[PDB]
């Protein structure tokens, strides 16, 4: 803890070429563990631990939950387009929901939706009502509140979501609690007369990390540029920070990498 469970849903009129129009993927503590799409018509494990700690019930049920959501989302695409007076084109429904369990026993939840990449509607903090982000979502607010949708999502988020998240974290404790050391490389090709120094951490886990440039031993932040944290294909991450120097001042710069996996912070020069 903190521990998180997150589901994100995409429903699109224009995927497109050999791509599924409907997808749902689940993440525990920010890592992919579950996948469903309209081509497969099947939920599948994406980590060894989820597969090893569930029975066939789990997959057959989730699969049919996925197939059900597929029909509901087909209609919702239709409904939102009509609200927006659309008769064609690329459009998308997005759902994003889940729960957090904070180290302190306190939980959190959120249920929010977008249309064409913009806020459409969401359950509000007290989980008693929905707040439409656009006028087109107003009839939806009215309908759901008449149908006691908020209460139904209060239960899912505060009980169902949390209880299952407890099971998941327990299943994949070892995997989620592991550490993987980044290999770091510093490099500086140039031209146009500027020495561009780059420092890259490869395959670190968990996610959090610090990669900084030092100039005369002093951290040169204001002007280093980061690509942020981007994922590898194996549940590890990558980051890449650059800085331009004089061609010759190269020897004055050092990249420093701090990570939980490291015996000591890495400190590396160019060349």
């Amino acid at each position: 803890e903190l521990h998180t469970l997150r589901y994100i849903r995409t429903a699109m009129t224009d995927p497109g070429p050999g791509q599924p129009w409907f997808v749902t993927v689940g993440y525990v503590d920010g890592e992919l563990f579950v996948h469903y799409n309209s081509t497969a018509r099947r939920y599948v494990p994406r980590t060894e631990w989820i597969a090893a700690n569930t029975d066939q019930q789990y997959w057959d049920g989730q699969t049919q939950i996925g197939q059900l959501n597929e029909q509901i989302n087909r209609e919702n695409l239709g409904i939102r387009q009509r609200r927006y007076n659309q008769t064609g084109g690329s459009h998308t429904v997005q759902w994003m929901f889940g729960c957090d369990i904070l180290e302190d026993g306190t939980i959190r939840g959120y249920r929010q939706s977008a249309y064409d990449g913009r806020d459409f509607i969401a359950l509000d903090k007290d989980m008693k009502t929905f707040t439409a982000a656009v006028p087109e979502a107003v009839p939806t607010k009215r309908k759901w509140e008449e149908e006691s949708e908020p209460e139904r999502w209060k239960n899912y988020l505060e009980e169902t979501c949390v209880e299952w998240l407890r099971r998941y974290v327990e299943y994949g404790k070892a995997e989620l609690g592991r550490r993987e050391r980044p290999e770091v490389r510093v490099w500086g090709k140039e031209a146009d007369g500027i020495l561009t120094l780059s420092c890259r951490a490869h395959g670190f886990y968990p996610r959090p990390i610090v990669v900084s440039w030092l100039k005369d031993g002093a951290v040169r932040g204001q002007d280093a540029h980061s690509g942020g944290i981007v994922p590898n294909g194996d549940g590890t991450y990558h980051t890449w920070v650059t800085i331009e120097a004089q061609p010759g001042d190269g020897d004055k710069y050092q990249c420093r990498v701090e990570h939980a996996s490291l015996p000591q912070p890495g400190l590396y020069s160019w060349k």
Binding site: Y7, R9, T24, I65, N73, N76, K143
Partner: peptide, 8 residues
């Protein structure tokens, strides 16, 4: 676990 959406 995943859960079912309501109808818009």
């Amino acid at each position: 676990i995943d859960w079912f959406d309501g109808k818009d």
